[PDB]
Amino acid sequence: PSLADSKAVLNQAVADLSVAHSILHQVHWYMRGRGFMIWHPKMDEYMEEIDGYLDEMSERLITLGGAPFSTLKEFSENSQLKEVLGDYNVTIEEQLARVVEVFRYLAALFQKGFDVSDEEGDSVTNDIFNVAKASIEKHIWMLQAELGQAPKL
Amino acid sequence: LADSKAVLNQAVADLSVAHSILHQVHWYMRGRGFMIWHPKMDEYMEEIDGYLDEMSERLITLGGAPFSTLKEFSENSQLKEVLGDYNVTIEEQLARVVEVFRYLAALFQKGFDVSDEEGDSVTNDIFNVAKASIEKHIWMLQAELGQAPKL
Amino acid sequence: LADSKAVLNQAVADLSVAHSILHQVHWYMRGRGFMIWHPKMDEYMEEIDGYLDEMSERLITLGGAPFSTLKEFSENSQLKEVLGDYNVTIEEQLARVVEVFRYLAALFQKGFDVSDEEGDSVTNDIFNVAKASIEKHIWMLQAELGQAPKL
Amino acid sequence: LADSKAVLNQAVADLSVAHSILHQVHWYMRGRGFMIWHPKMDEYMEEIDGYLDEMSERLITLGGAPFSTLKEFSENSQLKEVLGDYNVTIEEQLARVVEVFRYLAALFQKGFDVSDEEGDSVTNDIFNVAKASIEKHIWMLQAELGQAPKL
Amino acid sequence: GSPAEIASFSPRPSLADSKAVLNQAVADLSVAHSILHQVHWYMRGRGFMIWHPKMDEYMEEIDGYLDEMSERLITLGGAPFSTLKEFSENSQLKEVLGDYNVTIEEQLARVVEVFRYLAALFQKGFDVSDEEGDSVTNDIFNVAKASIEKHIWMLQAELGQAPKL
Amino acid sequence: LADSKAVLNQAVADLSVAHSILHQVHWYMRGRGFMIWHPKMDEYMEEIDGYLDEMSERLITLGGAPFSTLKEFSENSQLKEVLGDYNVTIEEQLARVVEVFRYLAALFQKGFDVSDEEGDSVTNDIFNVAKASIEKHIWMLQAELGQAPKL
Amino acid sequence: SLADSKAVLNQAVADLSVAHSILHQVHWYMRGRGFMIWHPKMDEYMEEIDGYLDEMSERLITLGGAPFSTLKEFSENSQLKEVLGDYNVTIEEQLARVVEVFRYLAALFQKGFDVSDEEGDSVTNDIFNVAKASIEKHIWMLQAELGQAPKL
Amino acid sequence: LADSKAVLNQAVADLSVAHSILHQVHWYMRGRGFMIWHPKMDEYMEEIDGYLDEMSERLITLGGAPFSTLKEFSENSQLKEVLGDYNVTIEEQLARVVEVFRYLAALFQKGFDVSDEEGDSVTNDIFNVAKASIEKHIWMLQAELGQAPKL
Amino acid sequence: LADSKAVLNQAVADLSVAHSILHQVHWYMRGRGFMIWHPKMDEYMEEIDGYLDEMSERLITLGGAPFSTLKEFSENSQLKEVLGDYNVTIEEQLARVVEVFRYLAALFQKGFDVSDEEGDSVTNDIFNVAKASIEKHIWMLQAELGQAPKL
Amino acid sequence: LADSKAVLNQAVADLSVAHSILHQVHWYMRGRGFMIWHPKMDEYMEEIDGYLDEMSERLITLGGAPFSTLKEFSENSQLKEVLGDYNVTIEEQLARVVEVFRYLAALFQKGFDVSDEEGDSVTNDIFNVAKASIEKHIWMLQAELGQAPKL
Amino acid sequence: LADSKAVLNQAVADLSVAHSILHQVHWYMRGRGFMIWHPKMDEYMEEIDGYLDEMSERLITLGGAPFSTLKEFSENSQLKEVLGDYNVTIEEQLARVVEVFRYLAALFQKGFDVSDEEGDSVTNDIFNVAKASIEKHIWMLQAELGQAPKL
Amino acid sequence: LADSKAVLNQAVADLSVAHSILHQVHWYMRGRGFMIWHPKMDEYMEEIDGYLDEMSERLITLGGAPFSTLKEFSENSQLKEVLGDYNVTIEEQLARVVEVFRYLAALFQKGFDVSDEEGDSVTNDIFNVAKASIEKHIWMLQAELGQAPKL
Ligand SMILES: [Ca+2]
Ligand SMILES: [Fe+3]
Ligand SMILES: [Fe+3]
Ligand SMILES: [Fe+3]
Ligand SMILES: [Fe+3]
Ligand SMILES: [Fe+3]
Ligand SMILES: [Fe+3]
Ligand SMILES: [Fe+3]
Ligand SMILES: [Fe+3]
Ligand SMILES: [Fe+3]
Ligand SMILES: [Fe+3]
């Protein structure tokens, strides 16, 4: 049932990235406070990057003979990420920490994806997860730096 | 302008679901015409997303609170999603896109109507511009399908 | 279309003063956030100048004579200028911009209304487009300032 | 000219003839100003062609059938063509272009009126945008000619 | 008295010199543009999304020949046709009313027939200009013929046929 | 004008007024040559605006406070404005621009001299570069007008 | 030392050269509905193939190796077989030929991945992995046009 | 290929002198039309330099030795230069350019004939291309001057 | 080589082998000048490939069947390939490229002649344009090697 | 010209150390403002590197021998480096950059002086241009820091 | 991650000295080949700076503290620098870059191995990509020098 | 500003002849290094042409009359031309380029000194900029030739 878990983790990523995109969009829209003018457009950049991973991962899953999740209901039910109603009263520091938590989870997911693909010998999938992990971890450093903190990976 | 705000938020939900449906069509497509229509879904998706950000931004500007979770999109949208299926024909998939766009154009007409009544002329333009392009796509998709636009 | 011509000319004056005020904010700005907001004023200035040229030139096209001297701009504009002062806070400078933009959005509503009354739909569109972008800026500035747009 | 479809198709014919007259001006031009105005006709021609495809597209989208033969253009257009002549002056050629543009601006107003009555807001916008640009060119051309726009 | 005014039929249609073939091209390219625009607007059926915009590209290329040829005619001291009446009457291409019910296969075949005609006209122009020693005009016709011939190959290929020039 | 800071502020006011004058010329221009000279006015305005922001930043950098209201620009400038008039000829308009430019060039020479004497070599450079290009423009405008530059 | 990595790189030099030739044939002899999309697509595929070739050949050179560099060497050492050009081959048949060539290339690149990993040559390993990824994506899209799963 | 080499080298001389004359027109031009025709001379000059370097590297390629000194250019060119004079009218300047161009078009025809006789098809194409463009320019210059091309 | 189709197909084979030989030179190159000449082979390869595709599509267009297998190219080409050798000097490599180019230029002359005889002027120009550029390269390569082009 | 060469060489060392210090600030930066100021350090670094290569190559051109080892940069630079520390506030970091920039502006003033004294006007210009830009940055950095430039 | 951090920081030191050595080569280069190899050094320097910023922000991301002073770079680098000397030949300069690059490639293998052991796959890939390009440069440099890469 | 005008005109002559000499080197070059130095002469030629047009515009702007015939250039230049010779080594060609640039650098110094004396600071800067770039080229050409700049 070849590359069963590589396919499974690719599909887990499809759901998680779909929710991550929704969370980033909420931060983008609901953001208020000093720093808005830099961080609001920054969320657009992050979203575009996340969308990039979604399409690389979902393509790779299809290529491997899988069937990507492709309804909001599948994304919601399969994602390990939780969403809450939007709220303008959240601080900038609080909004950025939420993004850090989302990104820490993605970097962990991508590590799992890297591990599982390596074990099954799916080196193409392995590379996709490694590249994505690398960038997310770099963003974790930068976001944490803004927050006067070490990356603490 | 509670009604203009209401229809803008309705659009946020529907455009969120429409993007998901376009993505499923993009991914699950099989048959002759794949190489043209697969990347065309990406164009439609980018356009849909552009409407999502215009309408969401305008709602925020009017003092509203956009839907901003998958649960809100799914619960509020009037579009129905189904499981992805590689066995759907390319002609059926394009017909599905047409039905989604017919829905959107009708939603944008409603948004036009509501904002026009409230005198919200900026919101009004947004719906009108979107409607124009969606209707143009309907013509092209229907022409590929050997049909009149039948607006 | 005397009213539409009149409001276009009012905008020529007010945009001309708006430009000066934006330039004052750009030059006298001090405080954390300078590096983002200083260049931002140049973007706002370029946009305001775009409205100026096109409103002034619509007025010419309609058989009008636009204000074209500093004296005409000062004496016809309803916006008041004050002496540059480096001790104004970043947050108060942004609030000054918001106040200027609230004024412009309100003026552009008036221009929409009068041109709509007179059936000058070309002039109507010019005001509608300008108002849209100015209102979007009020949302962003107010957000930086920890506040709702409150249009 | 009962409906938007009829006004769009009229525009299809008139824009086709307008293109032809502009091309004649381009080719037969002689006199001081040639080096400016010869390439300017190309810009105008491209602009006229943009209106053509738009208006034709919209007509097809609305379920109509555009005129699509030279006979149909020539017989349905209110514009009148004459034989090319090198002996027409620059200032007379520019005046000929002004008359065509006045005609088109008038036609676009007619399309604006009808689409508004029907509540075809998409078609209404198309005529509005085309009218705005053509009216600006009338100002410039008349200005070259030492004249007010006289819309 | 005053000089008499000759009353005679138009006559001619007589591709005997470079100036004449160029003006014939001016007329035929104008009608060819109209036919291509009809195919573009009225097209329906599978392949629309590729062939619709392809007509726009061909229209652009046709317009390019029109401006090179008509400029060369003016440069040679001629007077290009420049009214829809002169185009329609001088062109050998026949137009019909637009119809949404023509297959892609039939539409592409119509374009092939227009292109074969144009290639043939440009060969005439090449022959006429060469005999004249008008080498600049000769190259305009050669260049246009080459590209139009390449499109015939591709159109024919789409239709599952050899170019059959 | 006692020092570099003073001459820089003088330039802030005069460049503000020169921009306004160039804009009037741009808007009220009529006559053969409009199509070339109308857009040229925009180029000149953009250049003058460039000098304005280089001179006013240098003044701020030097510990000064730039004029930043229309009242100040108008009161301090040696250039005088008159009401717009469509009846001024193209030749008279270009001659007005030449006179503004001759003034600016002379002001920039004074800026050069004062800064040189104070040993402010950065400010000196700014004035030298501005003077170079304004003088090149005088040659070209004079050449259009059939005359020598007569610096 | 790195003998077999060098040998698999050189195998790829040969196979990619013949693959380029086959793609050019498909490009030229193509006929049928879809020509206007697929003809130019072959040029994209040829450019990508050529990219792999210069990459792999010059990694081989960098390793102290000597790339095949004549048509006879390409033709004899390649495992791909060429056939005479024939306009009567259908579009569907042509695309299926390209799939088979790409399936071969993807398997070759797996072999190259495996051999270079066995020899500790991680630079060569990555060249093959990157090339493999994009070829497999193409298989998906070609198969999809042909109404099938990728069937990797 | 003695004759083809000879005429290529003749073109090296004449184009070098033609470049110098164009530059004189560029520099000494005065009168209405300066702003269009002054930079147009730069375009003509670049084109001439292009023919210069096609013809000069074809001669080298053929095993010839191009003139490469001002003495060689001046002595071998059939074009005559006179001292610059600001007093020449714009229309006379353009007349001078047309003369240079008529000469070049005639030389390029000689090039064509000589290379055709000798069977140097590459040199032949170089001349034919240069002749086409120069002759188009004659049409346009003549048209500015209110005249037929009169090739 | 009977006709135009035959010489076009000869060029398909020969260009294919030439590309292979250029690629060998590119890869096996060692010596002073490598950094300029190695990438230069890529330029030459790109150009040869341009000729190949042009010449093959002209052959198809004429109703021919291009060679399209390595066996056909190798057997039909009159160029001979040898095994790659890193010990060949950079100047010997350049000399090998010249020999290939001299061969191509003569093949192109053969194609010119045959197509002219048949009256196939489109094919005639393809060969002429290719010959022109190859001959220009022969000049430059020979110049690098301190020699006349010897064409 | 040995004093100009000595100060050029001084600038080589100081700019090398300046680059290093900016890089530390870039890497070790923490606090609100990071996202703007982190990439800004890269812009400054690139600017510093430009002055470096400029001044080094002027030194070479003048027959000097630039410092070209880290030991020489470190030993000759009057700037002092300390171990990187993440616990420095972003305001302290920016003040640190201001102090490096004041040093550099003062160094460039010395080079202007020495080069003027010796009549090396090329070196003089290099120092002046560099000084202008550093002084502009000091204004902006100070404005971020709520302060006058205090040059 | 103890060793991956250590080897990243070694790279930070080594890349810094490597940039310095390359800059010396760039500056003190003399001999045939200068015009190609002088700018080449700039490309190599840019690439080494890319690895620097990469490796140094991966170290930071991992919770390390990059060397950020010249003293740290010199003291920790395994690469040794010497005074610049114009008498060094091109051959000798290029050989030195080769030795710098061989060292760097070896360090990157070491970094590959350590990160592989520790399972730091992101760091592993940074070293692998950097080693790949360095090794490709070793081939080209060695080819220019007439030798096999001899990795 | 008589001597300022004088030296500008001298430059016009010297740049015109320098251009001719560079073109001779470009065309007659043979030997190793051709592929880099041949196009390099084009870069140098374009730069020389830039100085020509600016010096000649500045002279016009100052009320002078530039030399504008090959006779004037040749008679007024202090540069000497000889017949082109393919037998010259590339090292001897580059040496001739260095001689011409050394001359220009000295001529530019004389222009700097004379304009500085007459207080024409705009002309002064033109010469200073042109001198800096020529001298940098001398450094590079000399380095290729294994020598110091020796200004
Ligand atoms: Ca498993
Ligand atoms: Fe996708
Ligand atoms: Fe947004
Ligand atoms: Fe304007
Ligand atoms: Fe034209
Ligand atoms: Fe390569
Ligand atoms: Fe050249
Ligand atoms: Fe092709
Ligand atoms: Fe450098
Ligand atoms: Fe960085
Ligand atoms: Fe000039």
CB contact under 8 A, I27 and G84: no
Contact in structure between J72 and J13 (CB atoms under 8 Å): yes
User: What is the number of the ligand closest to the CA of A53?
Assistant: 2
Positive or negative, the CA dihedral A91, A96, A100, A102 is: positive
Q: Which ligand is closest in space to the CA of residue B24?
A: 2
Determine the Cα–Cα distance for residues B87 and H134; give it in Å rounded to an integer: 63
Binding-site residues of F sit at: 26, 53, 57
Q: What is the 3-state secondary structure (H, E, C) of chain I?
A: CCCHHHHHHHHHHHHHHHHHHHHHHHHHCCCCCHHHHHHHHHHHHHHHHHHHHHHHHHHHHCCCCCCCCHHHHHHHCCCCCCCCCCCCCHHHHHHHHHHHHHHHHHHHHHHHHHHHHHCCHHHHHHHHHHHHHHHHHHHHHHHHCCCCCCC
The whole-angstrom distance between residue K12's C-alpha and the CA centroid of its chain comes to 9
Helix axes I4-28, I34-61, angle to 10 degrees: 160
User: What string of DSSP letters covers D84-123?
Assistant: --TTS-HHHHHHHHHHHHHHHHHHHHHHHHHHHHHT-HHH
> What whole-number distance in Å separates Cα of residue G59 and Cα of residue H132?
50
Q: Do H65 and L86 touch (CB under 8 A)?
A: yes
E and G: touch, per 3+ CB pairs < 8 A? yes
Test B29 with G144 for CB contact under 8 angstroms: yes
Q: What is the CA radius of gyration of chain K?
A: 16
CA angle E96, E98, E104 (to 5 degrees): 105
DSSP state for residue F63 in the 8-state scheme? T
Which residues are in the CB-under-5-Å shell of ion ligand 8? I 53
| L132-141 b/e (C-beta count within 10 Å ≥ 16 → b) | bbbbbbbbbb
Instruction: Name every residue whose Cβ is closer than 8 Å to that of residue A99 and which is 6 or more positions away in sequence.
Output: A23, A24, A27, A43, A46, A143
* Helix intervals (H) in chain E: 18-42, 48-75, 84-90, 104-132, 135-158
E4 burial class (0-12, 13-18, 19+ CB within 10 angstroms)?
exposed
CA pair distance L151, L99, nearest whole angstrom:
11
Q: How far is the CA of J46 from the centre of ligand 8 (A)?
A: 44
3-state secondary structure of E108: helix
In eight-state DSSP terms, residue C77 is: -
Q: How far apart are CA B23 and CA A72, in angstroms?
A: 11
Round to whole Å and give the CA distance between G105 and G114: 14
CB atoms within 10 A of CB E89: 13
DSSP collapsed to 3 states, chain L? CHHHHHHHHHHHHHHHHHHHHHHHHHHHCCCCCHHHHHHHHHHHHHHHHHHHHHHHHHHHHCCCCCCCCHHHHHHHCCCCCCCCCCCCCHHHHHHHHHHHHHHHHHHHHHHHHHHHHHCCHHHHHHHHHHHHHHHHHHHHHHHHCCCCCCC
Are D137 and D131 within 8 A, CB to CB? no
Q: Which two tokens stand for residue F61?
A: 């950098």
The answer to whether B84 touches B24, Cβ cutoff 8 Å, is yes
Is J53 at the interface with chain L, CB within 8 A?
A: no
Which of B121, B123, B129 should be substituted to probe chain C, the one whose Cβ sees the most C Cβ atoms within 10 Å? Answer: B121
Determination technique used: X-ray
Is the CB of residue J148 less than 8 Å away from at least one CB of chain C?
yes
Distance CA I72, CA I93 (A): 26
Q: What distance lies between CA K144 and its chain's CA centroid?
A: 19
Whole-number Å distance between alpha carbons of C16 and H54: 54
Residue J12 contacts residue J54 (beta carbons within 8 Å)? no
Q: Are D29 and D38 in contact (CB under 8 A)?
A: yes
Mapped onto helix, strand or coil, the DSSP state of residue K129 is: helix
> Quick check: B27 and A58 CB within 8 A?
yes
Inter-chain touch G152–A127, beta carbons under 8 Å? no
**In a 3-state reduction of DSSP, which class is residue G85?**
coil
Burial track F108-145 (b if 16+ CB lie within 10 A, e otherwise): bbebbebbbeeebbbbbbbbbebbbbbbbbbbbbbbbb
Other Cβ atoms within 10 Å of C135 Cβ, number: 22
User: Interhelix angle for B2-28 vs B34-61, to 10°?
Assistant: 160
Residue ranges of domains in chain E, CATH in brackets? 1-165 (1.20.1260.10)
Contact yes or no for B31/B88 (Cβ under 8 A): no
CA atoms within 13 A on the CB side of J144: 23
Name chain C's partners: 3 or more CB pairs within 8 A.
Answer: A, B, D, F, J
Instruction: Rounding to the nearest 10 degrees, give the CA dihedral for residues H68, H74, H79, H80.
Output: 150
Instruction: Compute the C-alpha angle G26/G27/G33, nearest 5°.
Output: 85
Residues C20, C77 contacting (CB under 8 angstroms): no
Closest CA to H31 of H144, H138, H147, H148: H144
Q: Which residues contact I46 (CB under 8 A, 6 or more apart)?
A: none
Alpha-helical runs (H) found in B29-89 = 34-61, 70-76
Task: Give the chains touching H; criterion: ≥3 Cβ pairs < 8 Å.
Answer: D, E, F, I, L
C-alpha angle D121-D123-D128 in degrees, rounded to nearest 5: 90
H helical segments located in G63-146: 71-77, 91-118, 122-145
Question: What is the rounded end-to-end Cα distance, in angstroms, of chain I?
Answer: 23
Phi and psi angles of residue J119, each rounded to the nearest 5 degrees, phi first: 80, 15
What's at D37, amino acid-wise? W
Mutate to test the interface with G, among A124, A128, A129, A131 (most CBs of G within 10 A): A124
Which residue, G86, G73, G68, G84, is CA-closest to G30? G86
Among I128, I129, I139, the residue with its CB nearest the CB of H57 is I139
Collapsing DSSP states into helix, strand and coil, what is residue K116?
helix
Q: Is B122 on the interface with C (CB under 8 A)?
A: yes
Per the CB < 8 Å rule, is A62 touching G140?
Answer: yes
CA distances from residue K56 to F25, J19, K7, K135 in whole angstroms, order as listed: 57, 15, 10, 21
Are the beta carbons of A56 and A68 closer than 8 angstroms? no
Contact (CB, 8 A) for J88 and J27: no
Question: Is J66 in Cβ contact with K84 (below 8 Å)?
Answer: yes
Resolution to 1 decimal, in Å?
1.8
Name the residue in chain H with its Cα closest to that of F37: H35
Q: What is the dihedral of CA F131, F137, F139, F143, to 10 degrees?
A: -170
Q: Position of tokens 């959240």?
A: A90
F142: DSSP letter: H
Half-sphere exposure of K28 (CA within 13 A, CB side): 23
Instruction: Look at the alpha carbons of C87, C89, C93, C99 in this order and tell me if their dihedral is positive or negative.
Output: negative
Q: Roughly what angle, to the nearest 10 degrees, separates helices E135-158 and H121-144?
A: 110
Q: Is G31 on the interface with E (CB under 8 A)?
A: yes
Q: Does A65 touch chain G (CB under 8 A)?
A: yes
DSSP sequence for E78-97: -----SHHHHHHH-------
Q: Which two tokens stand for residue H151?
A: 């090739």
Helical (H) or strand (E) element with E13 = none
Asked if A139 contacts A147 with a C-beta cutoff of 8 angstroms, the reply is no
Report the distance separating Cα L138 and Cα J121, nearest Å. 17
| Residues J13 and J69: beta-carbon distance below 8 Å | no
Distance CA K14, CA F74 (A): 61
Closest CA to D49 of D26, D76, D7, D17: D17
Binding-site annotation: residue ranges of B: 26, 53, 57
Residue K27 · residue J68 · CB < 8 Å: yes
Q: What distance in angstroms lies between residue D24's CA and the mean position of ligand 5's atoms?
A: 10
H/E element, G22 = helix G3-29
Buried b (16+ CB within 10 A) or exposed e, H25-36: bbbbbbbbbbbb
Give alpha helix (H) positions in chain C: 2-28, 34-61, 70-76, 90-118, 121-144
Residue F30 contacts by C-beta under 8 Å, 6 or more apart in sequence? D143, D146, D147, F86, F87, F90
Chains I/F: 3 or more C-beta pairs closer than 8 A? no
* Out of I31, I35, I38, closest to residue K146 by CB: I31
Compare all CA atoms of chain K with the CA of I29 and give the residue at the minimum distance.
K143
Distance CA A18, CA A55 (A): 10
L131 in J contact zone (CB under 8 Å)? yes
Say if CB F148 and CB F142 are below 8 A apart. Answer: yes
Q: Using alpha carbons only, what angle is made at residue K16 by residues K11 and K21, rounded to the nearest 5 degrees? A: 120
CB of D54 closer than 8 Å to CB of B136: no
CB contact, 8 Å: H26 with chain F?
no
| CA gap K143, K147 in Å, rounded | 5
Residue A49 tokens, joined: 């990057």
The verdict on D53 touching B (C-beta cutoff 8 Å) is no
Per the structure block, which two tokens stand in for B40? 């065309």
End-to-end CA distance of chain H: 29
Distance in angstroms (rounded) separating the CA atoms of residues F101 and B123: 47
Select the residue of C27, C65, C70 nearest F74 (Cβ to Cβ). C70
Q: Is G79 helix (H, G, I), strand (E, B) or coil?
A: coil
Residues contacting residue C43 through CB under 8 Å, at least 6 positions apart:
none
Å from CA of J54 to ligand 9 middle: 7
The burial class, CB within 10 Å (0-12 / 13-18 / 19+), for J117 is: exposed
* Ligand 1 centroid – CA A121 distance (Å): 10
Provide the residues around ligand 11 (an ion) whose CB is within 5 A.
Answer: L 53
Q: Which two tokens stand for residue D98?
A: 């002004």
> Is K31's Cβ below 8 Å from some Cβ in I?
no
> Which residue in C has a C-alpha nearest to residue F54's C-alpha?
C27
Please check whether residue L68 is in contact with residue H84, taking contact to mean a CB–CB distance below 8 angstroms: yes
CA of I27 to the centre of ligand 8 (A): 26
d(CA D125, CA D14): 19
Q: How open is the CA angle J19-J20-J25, to the nearest 5 degrees? A: 95
Contact G1, G65 (CB under 8 A): no
Residue type, I145: L
- Is K137 assigned a ligand-binding role in the annotation? no
Task: State the residue for tokens 């024909």.
Answer: B89
* Residue of A75, A68, A86 whose CA lies nearest to A32: A86
> Cα–Cα distances in Å, from C76 out to C14, C15, C68, C73, J108?
8, 11, 11, 5, 49
**CB atoms L149 and J122 under 8 Å:** no
